[PDB]
Amino acid sequence: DIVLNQSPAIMSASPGEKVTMTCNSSSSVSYMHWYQHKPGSSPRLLIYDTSNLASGVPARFSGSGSGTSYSLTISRMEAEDAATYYCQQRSSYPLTFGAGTKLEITRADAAPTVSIFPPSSEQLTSGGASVVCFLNNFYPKDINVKWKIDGSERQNGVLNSWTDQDSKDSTYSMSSTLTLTKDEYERHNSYTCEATHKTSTSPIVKSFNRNEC
Amino acid sequence: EVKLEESGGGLVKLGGSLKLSCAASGFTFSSYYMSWVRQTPEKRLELVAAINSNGGSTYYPDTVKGRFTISRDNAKNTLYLQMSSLKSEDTALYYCARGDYYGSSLYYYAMDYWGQGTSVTVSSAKTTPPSVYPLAPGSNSMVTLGCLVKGYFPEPVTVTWNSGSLSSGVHTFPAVLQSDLYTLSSSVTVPSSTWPSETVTCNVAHPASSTKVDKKIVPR
Numbered sequence: 001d002i003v004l005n006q007s008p009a010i011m012s013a014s015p016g017e018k019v020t021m022t023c024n025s026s027s028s029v030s031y032m033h034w035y036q037h038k039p040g041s042s043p044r045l046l047i048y049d050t051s052n053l054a055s056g057v058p059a060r061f062s063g064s065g066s067g068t069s070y071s072l073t074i075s076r077m078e079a080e081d082a083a084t085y086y087c088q089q090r091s092s093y094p095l096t097f098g099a100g101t102k103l104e105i106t107r108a109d110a111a112p113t114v115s116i117f118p119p120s121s122e123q124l125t126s127g128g129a130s131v132v133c134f135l136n137n138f139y140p141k142d143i144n145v146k147w148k149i150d151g152s153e154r155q156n157g158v159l160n161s162w163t164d165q166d167s168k169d170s171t172y173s174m175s176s177t178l179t180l181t182k183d184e185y186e187r188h189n190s191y192t193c194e195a196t197h198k199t200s201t202s203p204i205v206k207s208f209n210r211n212e213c
Numbered sequence: 214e215v216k217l218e219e220s221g222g223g224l225v226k227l228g229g230s231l232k233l234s235c236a237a238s239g240f241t242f243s244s245y246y247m248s249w250v251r252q253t254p255e256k257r258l259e260l261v262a263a264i265n266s267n268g269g270s271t272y273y274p275d276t277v278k279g280r281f282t283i284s285r286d287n288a289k290n291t292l293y294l295q296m297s298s299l300k301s302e303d304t305a306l307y308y309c310a311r312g313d314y315y316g317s318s319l320y321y322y323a324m325d326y327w328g329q330g331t332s333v334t335v336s337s338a339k340t341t342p343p344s345v346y347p348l349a350p351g352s353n354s355m356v357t358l359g360c361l362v363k364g365y366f367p368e369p370v371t372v373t374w375n376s377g378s379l380s381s382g383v384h385t386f387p388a389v390l391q392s393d394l395y396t397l398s399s400s401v402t403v404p405s406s407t408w409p410s411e412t413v414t415c416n417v418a419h420p421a422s423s424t425k426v427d428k429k430i431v432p433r
């Protein structure tokens with residue numbers, strides 16, 4: 001086992017921009033490989049033996065590094081190159097792969113579209129109640145969503161989930177589901193969903209009440 | 214043109230066993246080193262086993278050596294990987310890639326062609342059919358709807374809106390695991406003129422439990 005630290009874990013790049021990612025090893029290695037992995041497809045050999053490009057690879061990809069430090073370079077970034085790259089050592093067995101570097105596309109900031117949904121009548125029959133709040137199409141990825149029950153905040157019972165960067169607009173969509181019990185749900189009135197984002201200095205507030213409709 | 218196709222993945226309990234497969238096509242299968250590589254749920258790549266030209270030498274990492282068996286059938290152009298005493302960390306997407314050519318004058322120890330992989334889950338959790346819940350607003354020209362697919366196991370799960378005729382505005386968020394149960398949600402955005410004036414249906418399918426549910430999004 002040879003630890004291969006890939007830095008950084010995640011990073012963004014704009015089209016035409018230069019991207020450089022390293023991959024240091026705990027022990028000296030003779031050569032280093034590089035693979036490109038994109039969601040929906042299988043891994044792809046990108047560079048073999050440090051600086052040798054595989055078949056049908058654009059010249060913008062270049063390999064370098066020796067000893068305990070290997071780097072993968074992209075002359076000018078493009079949306080076609082948004083994926084996760086893994087480095088592999090080929091000096092000792094077993095053949096180990098690095099943690100991986102996730103490369104995202106940099107686009108213009110986009111405000112999220114918030115939307116809160118009360119629990120359905122089907123779930124309330126089973127003694128459960130889940131309040132969902134969608135935040136669709138925004139950038140960058142980092143975003144904070146907060147819950148409030150009758151004014152008071154709730155941090156336990158929430159389950160967030162982001163989506164991979166969309167290939168069309170290159171935005172991020174995030175979901176948040178607050179699950180509770182039927183009794184605890186029928187115990188309060190105001191259910192609010194707050195969304196604080198880079199493009200939203202103040203929080204975007206969406207709420208509803210049980211004493212309406 | 215080359216092709217690699219796996220098969221055999223599924224759900225097994227702690228200590229169970231499975232036997233995978235790899236369909237070779239578009240190249241002399243009896244001339245390349247074949248191996249298996251898995252991808253942990255945390256998106257980590259690990260080599261599990263490798264075999265040479267014939268059924269001679271084999272390699273197994275210490276984390277797997279002693280319970281996984283990698284055989285091949287050059288006459289049948291197939292690659293196998295027996296899995297026994299499966300622990301929890303064995304859960305992952307197992308690939309089968311091609312290694313170096315038998316006579317390359319010098320080996321590279323690289324895998325240039327991979328496969329789509331076959332998902333394998335090792336857990337003592339019981340297969341639970343999911344519960345589909347409609348998400349409708351409670352009292353903008355665009356309206357957002359969605360359905361909640363809570364409490365199921367194991368993966369995967371599929372969702373479509375109006376039988377796939379709604380591709381734009383759809384968002385299926387990755388499931389979340391909490392207490393041996395997955396929960397997924399999906400949203401769809403449509404013009405306010407189309408809803409609730411028309412019908413928006415949510416199509417959920419769970420191959421594991423072999424269940425399929427269609428749910429409408431009624432107003433209120």
Ligand SMILES: CC(C)(c1cc(I)c(O)c(I)c1)c1cc(I)c(O)c(I)c1
Nearest residue numbers: 246263264265270271272312313320322
């Ligand atoms: C896993 C490894 C390093 C290997 C395979 C066998 I079998 C052995 O007996 C030994 I020691 C070592 C290997 C992987 C690939 I992928 C190759 O193309 C080659 I060559 C070798």
